[PDB]
Amino acid sequence: YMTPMQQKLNEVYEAVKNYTDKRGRRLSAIFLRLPSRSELPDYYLTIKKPMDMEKIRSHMMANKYQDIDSMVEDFVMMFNNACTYNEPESLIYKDALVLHKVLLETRRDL
Ligand SMILES: Nc1nnc(-c2ccccc2O)cc1N1CC[NH2+]CC1
């Protein structure tokens, strides 16, 4: 069984994962797993602390987050990373902005 804190962390995680735009697209999809270092080596020269949602979920399911802010900080790092690597005109950049706002609104509601 999972702790109440794990259940709250999961509610925040699922809110980001499952958010859909007006067309029904989950903006989380590209963030679930980073490209490999072999695939995209220059990402890892620009981004000093890589993060994706696979990492966050396994940490949460390993009962390692002591509170909600610790998870939020990892999401914020991931979205900051996406917006550092990609240009502001790009779709991934814009998706990261929206999901960062979704994250904060979810934390406020909970
Ligand atoms: N351009 C990209 N930027 N960022 C990510 C990315 C993925 C997960 C977590 C954080 C991230 O920043 C992925 C990207 N692409 C995937 C598709 N193939 C081209 C590279």
Side-chain angles (χ1 to χ4, degrees), residues 1-16 18-21 23-107 109-110:
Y1 314 121
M2 53 207 305
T3 77
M5 169 70 38
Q6 271 178 301
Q7 291 162 62
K8 178 175 236 219
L9 288 154
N10 192 40
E11 182 157 23
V12 170
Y13 183 91
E14 289 296 296
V16 173
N18 297 331
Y19 175 87
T20 58
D21 64 10
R23 296 179 68 259
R25 178 173 64 93
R26 284 181 180 198
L27 269 39
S28 62
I30 204 69
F31 305 109
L32 298 176
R33 174 152 149 83
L34 285 159
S36 72
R37 300 179 187 269
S38 311
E39 176 180 335
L40 196 62
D42 87 315
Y43 185 94
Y44 296 88
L45 296 179
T46 70
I47 298 304
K48 303 298 167 63
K49 178 56 187 213
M51 184 61 53
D52 59 26
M53 293 187 57
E54 267 205 354
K55 291 190 185 71
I56 297 174
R57 196 192 186 276
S58 72
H59 206 69
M60 175 189 53
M61 293 311 178
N63 190 29
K64 281 183 165 61
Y65 285 125
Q66 82 277 8
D67 59 23
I68 297 305
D69 288 347
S70 279
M71 158 170 288
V72 169
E73 286 171 28
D74 281 343
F75 269 109
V76 167
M77 173 72 66
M78 180 189 79
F79 295 131
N80 284 357
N81 289 342
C83 290
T84 303
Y85 180 75
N86 300 279
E87 296 298 321
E89 295 78 16
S90 71
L91 179 61
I92 291 164
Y93 188 111
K94 290 184 191 52
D95 285 347
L97 289 187
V98 169
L99 286 183
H100 189 161
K101 296 168 183 171
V102 168
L103 173 75
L104 298 177
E105 294 165 350
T106 298
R107 181 184 62 184
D109 283 349
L110 306 181

